[PDB]
RNA sequence: AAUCCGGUUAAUAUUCCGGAACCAGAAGGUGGAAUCAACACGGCAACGUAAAUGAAGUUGGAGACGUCGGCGGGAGCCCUGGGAAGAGUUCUCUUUUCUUUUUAACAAACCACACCCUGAAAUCGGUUUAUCCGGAGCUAGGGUAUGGUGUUUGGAAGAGUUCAGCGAUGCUGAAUCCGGUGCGCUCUCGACGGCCCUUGAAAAUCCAACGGAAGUU
């Protein structure tokens, strides 16, 4: 919000449409889930300093999730306490990425 | 003249080699107007927080010529 | 003050008012169109002459 | 009753103006999302070019390539024709889920493209594949 | 205060169009304003098209492509109704020709 | 195609000085965007957007078009209530008399006539100052575009003006405010209504369309 109206970074790992993006409320990690079935976990750490550009790096690409009717990960949720990710698939499965 | 509200953007424009000088204006409403002179536009940033103005001041690169109230 | 101007103002207030009772529901579309219709023929020379016309209607 | 699935129709409004489409499914009953006679139509956007034996096989395929489009349009914005085309793989592929889910929409565009290509290779419905001059 | 014209083009004409403004020095000044732009008009019907900014001819080059045309066949040249009329007339004429050829061949 | 403000001369200023912009052309570069599904997606639609190739050939628009009347909008000027400043007048009366009270080009975000969608209407409705339109689809509801303008800034108070002082003409204080308006005058724009008949210059120039040539690196 303090850098520009245009996006600060653009990321296009996903081979399919990106469904949901969730930022962990406390830990400096965020996740993106798409129809490809893979969830991308990125380390986004923010400084309060004006000169300090936030450091965004990938951390993991979570896989082994089913795809049904060209639908993969629909929603992702971050555990309020630790780095645990709740991934909801199209097969009726919920995955605990610990 | 362009009015810029994003402080970071003001930093990036300042780091740009086009920027030549910057002016600090102390208004009666205790606002600091950071007017950065570029090639085509004079980019101004009005900051309401006084300490934000000072913490802004030395975060400006030293090579840039900052100036007192015009 | 020209006679054109007084009618110029009188018609607008008469028309501006006749719309406002219409949207407030005091008069339906049919009687409003009639009320708009006579008012074009200077039927009322002043505002309250028209307001009494709504009450009797 | 003049609008039936598989009937060739013509879009007259919107970006795809004057393009030939086939009625995939009729929703003349209407819906809350589209309170009008909206029917899903799959048509041709980029009409295929004229295949010539002189050009190479790669060139031949590229000219035969057809850009399709799936759209929901109102009935009065469509114009029906006597021509009708029926193809089995385009039965039931379309639904509310497909037009909601972007990947399903992309998948639907893939199949309607593939089925248009095989029909062009088979040399059937040449007039529909032919662009209309106006 | 009485103000004179900035230029020396005496005998003010259509080209000599000015505006009165108050300067930060508290002076009333003549500001010459160029004529207002004209929106493009439809070829078939003639009504100005919808969605095109009304600017000057030389100015139109500065705009991008999407800002000068509408995403439709004959967009930026014909109105939507004119496009609709053009499309249906062409199809009906083609059908009238196809039945006429059918009648002649039988 | 495209410029504004302030200052400056004994005599020149939209030219000079200070500051702030704009237009046109020119190349690469940086970043972003589209493609082995060949040249983007969304909306029922009017159409929208950061981009989103288009040869030959074929068109369209701007330029570019009479006159008159009324209505509406905005700006400046004029009128005027207070606020402030100074100069008055004043035995007394007189919250009083007189004078002043600025924001440019340009750049930002937002702020109302044509059309679309639902709709099928006369028991005729909507409506002008001036009855105009409506199954060739009214009133009503939701939209789309055109933004004449207005709002908030930036420019910009650091400038200008007016008062007080203090010391080369410098330095320091303050204020430069809140309204109300009118058949008002000047200029411009929008929406109509006539009269036309005389149905109302040309070109340079700029834009768009149809058309589909060509085409991991």
């Amino acid at each position: 919000l303090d850098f520009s109206s245009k996006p600060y970074k653009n990321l296009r790992y996903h081979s399919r449409a990106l469904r949901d993006v969730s930022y962990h409320p406390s830990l400096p990690l965020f996740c993106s889930g798409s129809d490809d079935g893979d969830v991308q976990v990125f380390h986004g750490r923010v400084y309060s300093d004006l000169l300090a550009n936030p450091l965004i790096v990938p951390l993991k690409i979570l896989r082994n999730h089913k795809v049904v009717d060209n639908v993969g990960v629909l929603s992702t949720c971050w555990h309020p306490k630790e780095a645990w990710l709740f991934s909801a698939g199209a097969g009726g499965e919920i995955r605990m990425w610990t | 003249p362009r009015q810029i509200s994003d402080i970071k953007q003001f930093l990036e424009i300042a780091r740009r080699k086009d920027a030549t000088s910057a002016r600090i204006k102390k208004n009666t409403n205790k606002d600091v107007k950071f007017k950065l002179r570029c090639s085509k536009y004079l980019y101004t940033l009005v900051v309401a927080d006084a300490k934000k103005a000072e913490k802004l001041r030395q975060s400006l690169p030293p090579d840039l010529t900052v100036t007192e109230v015009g | 003050m020209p006679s054109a101007v007084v009618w110029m103002r009188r018609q607008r207030v008469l028309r501006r008012l006749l719309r406002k009772y219409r949207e407030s529901g005091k008069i339906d579309k049919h009687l409003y169109h009639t009320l708009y219709l006579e008012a074009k023929g200077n039927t009322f020379k002043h505002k309250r002459a028209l307001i009494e016309h709504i009450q009797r209607a | 009753k003049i609008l039936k699935p598989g009937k060739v129709a013509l879009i007259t409004r919107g970006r795809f103006a004057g393009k030939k489409v086939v009625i995939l499914q009729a929703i003349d009953q209407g819906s809350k999302s589209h309170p009008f006679g909206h029917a899903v139509v799959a048509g041709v956007e980029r009409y295929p070019l004229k295949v010539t034996k002189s050009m190479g096989a790669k060139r031949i395929a590229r000219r035969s390539r057809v850009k399709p489009f799936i759209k929901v349009v109102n009935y009065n914005h469509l114009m029906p024709t006597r021509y009708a085309l029926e193809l089995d793989n385009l039965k039931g592929l379309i639904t509310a889920d497909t037009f909601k889910e972007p990947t399903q929409r992309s998948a639907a565009r893939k199949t309607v493209k593939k089925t248009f290509e095989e029909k062009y290779q088979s040399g059937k419905s040449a007039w529909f594949f032919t662009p209309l001059r106006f | 205060q009485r103000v004179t014209y900035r230029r020396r083009l005496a005998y003010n004409t259509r080209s000599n169009r000015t505006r009165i403004i108050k300067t930060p020095g508290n002076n009333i000044r003549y500001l010459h304003i160029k004529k207002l732009g004209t929106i493009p008009r439809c070829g078939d019907t003639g009504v100005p098209l919808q969605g095109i900014p009304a600017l000057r001819p030389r100015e139109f080059a500065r705009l991008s492509h999407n800002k000068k045309t509408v995403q439709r066949a004959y967009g930026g040249c014909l109105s939507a109704n004119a496009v609709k009329d053009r499309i249906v007339r062409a199809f009906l004429i083609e059908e009238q020709k196809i039945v006429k050829q059918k009648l002649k061949q039988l």
Side-chain angles (χ1 to χ4, degrees):
Chain A
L1 196 76
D2 14 296
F3 194 102
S4 168
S5 303
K6 317 284 189 63
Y8 161 61
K9 292 281 287 168
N10 287 325
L11 289 78
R12 52 174 72 259
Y13 301 102
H14 279 302
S15 60
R16 299 300 172 188
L18 180 47
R19 301 319 301 269
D20 195 76
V21 284
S22 298
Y23 215 168
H24 192 292
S26 306
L27 275 170
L29 309 175
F30 55 105
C31 67
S32 59
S34 170
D35 286 328
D36 53 355
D38 306 337
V39 184
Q40 313 166 354
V41 169
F42 300 153
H43 167 55
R45 189 261 306 279
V46 175
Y47 315 108
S48 55
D49 189 1
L50 305 181
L51 258 285
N53 212 6
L55 182 64
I56 310 165
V57 290
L59 195 60
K60 194 54 204 66
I61 302 294
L62 301 174
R63 283 185 299 274
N64 311 95
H65 209 185
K66 306 170 187 172
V67 180
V68 174
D69 295 335
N70 305 270
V71 184
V73 192
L74 270 185
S75 184
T76 53
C77 215
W78 273 115
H79 193 279
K81 291 194 295 187
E82 273 192 16
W84 295 330
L85 171 57
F86 306 103
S87 309
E93 283 203 353
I94 313 299
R95 302 301 198 92
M96 206 55 282
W97 297 95
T98 206
Chain B
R2 288 283 196 282
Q3 188 188 347
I4 274 54
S5 69
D6 274 21
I7 301 71
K8 305 194 56 197
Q9 195 45 337
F10 198 86
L11 278 35
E12 205 44 295
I13 293 171
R15 260 82 64 58
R16 236 158 65 170
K17 305 84 175 171
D18 175 23
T20 38
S21 72
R23 318 155 207 171
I24 292 91
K25 184 65 189 292
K26 291 295 294 182
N27 266 66
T28 69
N29 76 359
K30 306 306 101 176
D31 259 304
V32 169
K33 274 193 171 140
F34 284 96
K35 311 181 191 185
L36 182 62
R37 173 75 254 189
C38 281
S39 59
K40 162 150 46 155
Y41 294 125
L42 173 71
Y43 300 98
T44 179
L45 164 55
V46 190
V47 278
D49 175 26
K51 166 275 315 174
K52 193 58 65 184
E54 284 103 11
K55 74 178 321 183
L56 182 31
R57 179 177 289 61
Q58 61 288 324
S59 32
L60 266 294
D63 58 351
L64 190 58
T65 88
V66 284
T67 328
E68 193 186 1
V69 58
Chain C
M1 153 150 273
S3 79
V5 179
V6 300
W7 154 275
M8 179 29 207
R9 295 179 180 180
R10 178 166 62 241
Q11 275 294 323
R12 280 164 144 276
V13 50
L14 291 175
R15 290 178 172 175
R16 185 260 304 153
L17 67 91
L18 273 181
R19 307 149 91 86
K20 81 178 292 299
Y21 315 71
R22 175 172 52 79
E23 51 63 34
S24 65
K26 294 175 71 170
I27 313 79
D28 67 346
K29 60 200 289 283
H30 303 288
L31 173 59
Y32 158 82
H33 190 189
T34 67
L35 290 158
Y36 187 94
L37 175 141
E38 313 104 348
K40 175 155 207 189
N42 69 56
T43 299
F44 318 81
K45 295 177 178 179
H46 63 70
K47 173 174 181 283
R48 76 192 73 85
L50 186 41
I51 331 172
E52 324 328 306
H53 214 103
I54 286 68
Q55 325 329 344
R56 66 177 64 114
Chain D
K1 73 179 72 65
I2 37 159
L3 273 301
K4 294 292 189 291
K7 185 174 290 297
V8 189
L10 182 126
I11 302 183
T12 198
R13 304 292 280 261
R15 186 159 46 85
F16 305 88
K19 320 301 274 171
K20 316 185 170 173
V21 306
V22 295
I23 262 54
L24 254 287
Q25 176 259 352
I27 331 176
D28 54 353
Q29 63 267 45
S31 87
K32 63 182 181 293
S33 67
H34 297 132
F36 38 83
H38 64 296
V40 174
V41 284
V44 166
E45 203 313 325
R46 182 171 302 135
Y47 289 96
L49 273 301
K50 276 64 56 181
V51 152
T52 56
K53 268 75 68 178
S54 88
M55 272 156 114
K58 297 297 185 287
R59 307 191 188 233
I60 283 290
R62 302 164 326 171
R63 294 178 68 77
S64 326
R65 289 175 181 170
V66 173
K67 186 173 184 178
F69 69 105
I70 47 172
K71 187 72 191 302
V72 170
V73 201
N74 202 334
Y75 275 156
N76 47 6
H77 302 150
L78 303 213
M79 266 210 41
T81 71
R82 262 199 165 183
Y83 270 81
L85 198 299
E86 293 82 3
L87 176 291
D88 39 350
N89 323 54
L90 305 212
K91 260 77 175 177
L93 93 175
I94 201 45
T95 180
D97 199 20
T98 66
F99 253 52
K100 292 292 103 176
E101 266 269 28
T103 313
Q104 279 174 3
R105 179 178 289 187
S106 100
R109 291 181 183 173
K110 292 187 179 69
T111 88
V112 299
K113 175 183 278 288
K114 293 188 289 291
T115 207
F116 276 169
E117 303 312 47
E118 73 69 359
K119 182 173 311 306
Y120 212 60
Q121 302 330 103
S122 79
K124 298 287 98 175
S125 198
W127 179 90
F128 158 78
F129 289 133
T130 278
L132 180 174
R133 312 275 174 263
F134 67 95
Chain E
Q1 322 169 244
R2 279 82 68 84
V3 279
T4 62
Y5 277 160
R6 308 293 290 272
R7 288 92 184 275
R8 312 175 83 114
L9 197 145
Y11 312 89
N12 42 1
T13 61
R14 207 289 315 157
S15 159
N16 179 281
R17 281 177 58 243
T18 72
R19 186 265 305 266
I20 291 288
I21 206 62
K22 184 72 76 70
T23 60
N26 195 73
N27 280 314
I28 55 198
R29 293 263 175 85
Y30 278 131
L31 264 292
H32 304 257
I33 51 174
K34 332 290 190 156
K35 61 181 77 176
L36 206 53
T38 301
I39 183 161
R41 295 184 178 93
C42 171
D44 271 357
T45 80
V47 47
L49 293 105
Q50 185 184 1
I52 317 302
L55 301 167
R56 296 300 298 163
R58 169 58 86 158
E59 200 280 357
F60 278 159
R62 298 210 292 276
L63 291 168
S64 167
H65 196 63
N66 304 64
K67 275 60 190 169
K68 304 185 289 278
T69 187
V70 178
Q71 316 309 291
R72 184 171 15 86
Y74 299 77
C77 189
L78 294 183
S79 298
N81 295 350
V83 167
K84 162 198 262 313
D85 152 33
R86 181 77 66 83
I87 299 169
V88 317
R89 167 194 326 276
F91 175 67
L92 299 198
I93 285 182
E94 179 303 337
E95 215 65 353
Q96 271 158 24
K97 183 222 55 43
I98 211 186
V99 292
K100 266 37 217 173
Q101 89 77 38
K102 162 278 208 163
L103 285 186
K104 299 289 99 175
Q105 55 84 11
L106 60 85

